[PDB]
Amino acid sequence: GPVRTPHADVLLASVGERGVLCDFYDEGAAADGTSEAREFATRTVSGPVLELAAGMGRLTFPFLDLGWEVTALELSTSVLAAFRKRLAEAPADVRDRCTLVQGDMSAFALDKRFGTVVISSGSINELDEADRRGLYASVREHLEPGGKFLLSLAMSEAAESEPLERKQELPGRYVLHVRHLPAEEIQEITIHPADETTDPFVVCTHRRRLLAPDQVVRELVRSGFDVIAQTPFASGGAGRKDMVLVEAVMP
Amino acid sequence: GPVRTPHADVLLASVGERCDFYADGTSEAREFATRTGPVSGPVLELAAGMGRLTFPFLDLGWEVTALELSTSVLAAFRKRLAEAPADVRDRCTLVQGDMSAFALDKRFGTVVISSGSINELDEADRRGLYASVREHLEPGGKFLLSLAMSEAAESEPLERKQELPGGRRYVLHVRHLPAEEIQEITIHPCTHRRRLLAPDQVVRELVRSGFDVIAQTPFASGGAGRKDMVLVEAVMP
Numbered sequence A: 001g002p003v004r005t006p007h008a009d010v011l012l013a014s015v016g017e018r019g020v021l022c023d024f025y026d027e028g029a030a031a032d033g034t035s036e037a038r039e040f041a042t043r044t045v046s047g048p049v050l051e052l053a054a055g056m057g058r059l060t061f062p063f064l065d066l067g068w069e070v071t072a073l074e075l076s077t078s079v080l081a082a083f084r085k086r087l088a089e090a091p092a093d094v095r096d097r098c099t100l101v102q103g104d105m106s107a108f109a110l111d112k113r114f115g116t117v118v119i120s121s122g123s124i125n126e127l128d129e130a131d132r133r134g135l136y137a138s139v140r141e142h143l144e145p146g147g148k149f150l151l152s153l154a155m156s157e158a159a160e161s162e163p164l165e166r167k168q169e170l171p172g173r174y175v176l177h178v179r180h181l182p183a184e185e186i187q188e189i190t191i192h193p194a195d196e197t198t199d200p201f202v203v204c205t206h207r208r209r210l211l212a213p214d215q216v217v218r219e220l221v222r223s224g225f226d227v228i229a230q231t232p233f234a235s236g237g238a239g240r241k242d243m244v245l246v247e248a249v250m251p
Numbered sequence B: 001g002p003v004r005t006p007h008a009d010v011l012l013a014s015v016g017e018r019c020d021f022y023a024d025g026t027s028e029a030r031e032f033a034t035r036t037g038p039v040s041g042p043v044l045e046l047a048a049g050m051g052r053l054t055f056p057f058l059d060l061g062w063e064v065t066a067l068e069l070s071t072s073v074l075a076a077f078r079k080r081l082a083e084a085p086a087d088v089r090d091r092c093t094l095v096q097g098d099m100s101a102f103a104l105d106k107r108f109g110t111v112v113i114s115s116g117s118i119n120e121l122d123e124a125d126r127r128g129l130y131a132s133v134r135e136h137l138e139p140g141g142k143f144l145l146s147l148a149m150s151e152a153a154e155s156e157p158l159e160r161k162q163e164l165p166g167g168r169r170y171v172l173h174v175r176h177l178p179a180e181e182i183q184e185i186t187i188h189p190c191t192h193r194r195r196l197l198a199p200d201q202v203v204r205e206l207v208r209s210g211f212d213v214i215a216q217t218p219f220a221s222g223g224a225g226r227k228d229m230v231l232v233e234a235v236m237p
């Protein structure tokens, strides 16, 4: 069914149903990022912008609020429908710089090039390694000359750190430097009410892919982009910096 | 063209003017034999290199089809086989092949692969491996893998709490399960990156594609000291 996490295991045992184990995407009770959008803006606008897997407009609207023309591309027709509902209930000027398009960000093709192409950490992490290559290839084909590819990328503690070195003393028949660089983790969340009474006690688990920023960056280089900047920021305006803003251009 | 690490460039100028980078299988093979039993019927070792484990396996008396991709490496292996005595040599059948896609039309009691071999495939190819391996297992037959386990892979992931409102108050728990790291080397008076899967990540992948993983046994590769490897047992339901 849902993912049975270790903390959830204990809770659900302790609470005896009453408690219910759920994935974080079914029911139910269960988006604001103007600080992330702002991070994207800082790091650019000449022309129109393409947002990939724009979901429901979490960033797309903030972008439109800054006067930008946005082609928002989404795969889910249902999310697409919901986006178009929000879009319907907003000022015709706001409405008219926005273009929705169904599409697969791993293999998409528009009758249009673009000065700026943006993708949020949430989205890039939906793709495996193969599709990620598809994305890079695709994007390259949609950048006007000199245009930037801007990516936000969540940064785990392990990816934030300077990987631990281990020097050695191995003679031949030298000094050896090993590093274990992070490439990909699984972010696992568990959310439950602070009580235990409540009734019902719904326990929310989710597992998702979480790529190391440096990893994406290597992928990017390997695929013909140059990464001209990488900038840590906190997603909620202040706190620990838990995100990296990456700029890529075609050489 | 060769990978330019941080420690390289801080030695590349911190020297002036005066390249990429391209062990004993006894303990390791024994660990495989521990989780094998009988053995009735022959064994198939995928990506056998040049016999580092194969020769151990033969000394356990086993019958081994050793699959390897490389024409050059097969040349080495064949010569080594030729210097072995004849009962060793006659229990070893070499085959050029691709561990990610191969038919051999025969099935095997046991199927075996080494950490270095599986770490050489990306995700898609590993999907193919498990599919192949399946196609080549006799029922009840065991699929054994050894997997390097780094310090990241073995540690209990650190957990972060945090209280949040609505207006209902919630508790939020976040763990980071390791899955893939990069092994980066700098040899030194010389460079190499490489894949290093988390044994757990491989296990998840085995389940995702058919097998029930019946055992995960940590062992030292050297055959002494800290257990730096994991022997995984898989079978087809």
Ligand SMILES: Nc1ncnc2c1ncn2[C@@H]1O[C@H](CSCC[C@H](N)C(=O)O)[C@@H](O)[C@H]1O
Residues within 6 Å of the ligand: A031, A052, A053, A054, A055, A056, A057, A058, A059, A073, A074, A075, A076, A079, A103, A104, A105, A106, A120, A122, A123, A126
């Ligand atoms: N292959 C694909 N092609 C296009 N969109 C995809 C996709 N796979 C997943 N998605 C979409 O990517 C979104 C990920 S969540 C990101 C939403 C938004 N950019 C934000 O910042 O909140 C989801 O809306 C999902 O429908």
